[PDB]
Scaffold this active site. Structure first.
Site, PDB file in Angstrom:
ATOM      1  N   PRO B   2       0.788  -1.326  -0.059  1.00  0.00           N
ATOM      2  CA  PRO B   2       0.078  -0.182   0.084  1.00  0.00           C
ATOM      3  C   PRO B   2       0.941   1.254   0.070  1.00  0.00           C
ATOM      4  O   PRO B   2       1.793   1.399   0.429  1.00  0.00           O
ATOM      5  CB  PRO B   2      -0.754  -0.230   1.217  1.00  0.00           C
ATOM      6  CG  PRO B   2       0.048  -0.827   2.184  1.00  0.00           C
ATOM      7  CD  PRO B   2       0.600  -2.053   1.313  1.00  0.00           C
ATOM      8  N   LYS B  33      -0.500  -5.382   6.646  1.00  0.00           N
ATOM      9  CA  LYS B  33       0.557  -5.349   5.570  1.00  0.00           C
ATOM     10  C   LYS B  33       1.798  -4.691   6.174  1.00  0.00           C
ATOM     11  O   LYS B  33       1.851  -3.778   6.965  1.00  0.00           O
ATOM     12  CB  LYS B  33       0.169  -4.573   4.346  1.00  0.00           C
ATOM     13  CG  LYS B  33      -0.740  -5.281   3.284  1.00  0.00           C
ATOM     14  CD  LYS B  33      -0.640  -4.816   1.909  1.00  0.00           C
ATOM     15  CE  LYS B  33      -1.323  -5.854   1.009  1.00  0.00           C
ATOM     16  NZ  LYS B  33      -1.233  -5.353  -0.556  1.00  0.00           N
ATOM     17  N   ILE B  65      -2.159  -3.762  -3.006  1.00  0.00           N
ATOM     18  CA  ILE B  65      -2.110  -5.034  -3.918  1.00  0.00           C
ATOM     19  C   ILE B  65      -3.209  -5.788  -2.853  1.00  0.00           C
ATOM     20  O   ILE B  65      -2.564  -6.669  -2.061  1.00  0.00           O
ATOM     21  CB  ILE B  65      -0.962  -5.537  -3.975  1.00  0.00           C
ATOM     22  CG1 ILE B  65      -0.087  -4.723  -5.249  1.00  0.00           C
ATOM     23  CG2 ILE B  65      -1.219  -7.022  -4.588  1.00  0.00           C
ATOM     24  CD1 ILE B  65       1.101  -5.220  -5.432  1.00  0.00           C
ATOM     25  N   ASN B  98     -10.405   7.589  -1.983  1.00  0.00           N
ATOM     26  CA  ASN B  98     -10.564   6.329  -3.254  1.00  0.00           C
ATOM     27  C   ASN B  98      -9.510   5.434  -2.830  1.00  0.00           C
ATOM     28  O   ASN B  98      -8.437   5.295  -2.891  1.00  0.00           O
ATOM     29  CB  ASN B  98      -9.950   7.104  -4.474  1.00  0.00           C
ATOM     30  CG  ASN B  98     -10.904   8.665  -4.806  1.00  0.00           C
ATOM     31  OD1 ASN B  98     -11.953   8.468  -4.459  1.00  0.00           O
ATOM     32  ND2 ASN B  98     -10.000   9.561  -5.259  1.00  0.00           N
TER      33      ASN B  98
END
Lengths: 115, 115, 115
Positions: B2, B33, B65, B98
């Site tokens: 990220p 993560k 991801i 977003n």
């Protein structure tokens, strides 16, 4: 619920103090989406080239949950391109606009998403 | 792996000198993560309006991801919205986020991609 | 018709005055797309961390209508990573690059789209 941003090398000082309300009023009509749910972001003084020229140009992006399609995007372009040359003095040919159709579940707002 | 960025009109000076480590520590837990694989980008002093108001607002984006989904994004929002009002004094209602689920083959890193 | 941008914390002053023509010439070859249709955007002096370190890093993005795929993106990465450390002194491991394959109908240009 759209967001439209302009990233240009034009200097902050050539930014009409109207643009913000201006692009808000226009996109609102164009996309037929609530003026309150539209956010505009203007980024001047930027280091960019287009076709290897550092002359006035812009790379914009319009993100919207819907209101994005074939004929729509063309309509938006002509609209945004007219506004950009008139207000920022940026020629239509040195401008790209990336259109994006967001999925409600992927748009956080006020604590949750639009899903 | 990220990346989370904040684009706001709030001035650089209201940016807690903690935010960076702060959003890193939090997102790391949230998304589960590696903290080392998270990059944070803060963009203040920006020219933006929301609902036609130039009052404090923000348009953020979280690219990861995986770790992106329905209930996840809501969880992230509440998290990021809590942090953003507390640290930057940005009301939750004048903030968009977003969320993006990247494909490993489309993320270059250290010379290659994650594919 | 690609756009490549670099968002880094490195200071404006370390930005080789060649980069723009440089990344244009290179990407043009790499992607085999017209040099005139490539726009480069460089964003320095930025507030960002990577792995919780505020040392030199970068989050880039390459948007292109096609010329995006598996082996391509790796090739691009090694290319862009070589250029970024040499020119901006940014280590390859503290750099992310988001690759995007745009749809012609979603790219406004000079008044219309590429559709």
């Amino acid at each position: 619920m759209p967001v439209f941003t302009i990233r240009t090398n034009v200097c902050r000082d050539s930014v009409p103090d109207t643009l913000l309300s201006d692009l808000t009023k226009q996109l609102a009509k164009a996309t037929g989406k609530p003026a309150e749910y539209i956010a505009i972001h203007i980024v001047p003084d930027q280091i960019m080239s287009f076709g290897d020229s550092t002359d006035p140009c812009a790379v914009c992006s319009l993100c919207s949950i819907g209101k994005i399609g074939g004929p729509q995007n063309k309509s938006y372009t002509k609209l945004l391109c007219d506004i950009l040359t008139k207000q920022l003095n940026i020629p239509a040919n040195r401008v790209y606009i990336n259109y994006y159709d967001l999925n409600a579940a992927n748009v956080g707002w006020n604590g949750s998403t639009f899903a």
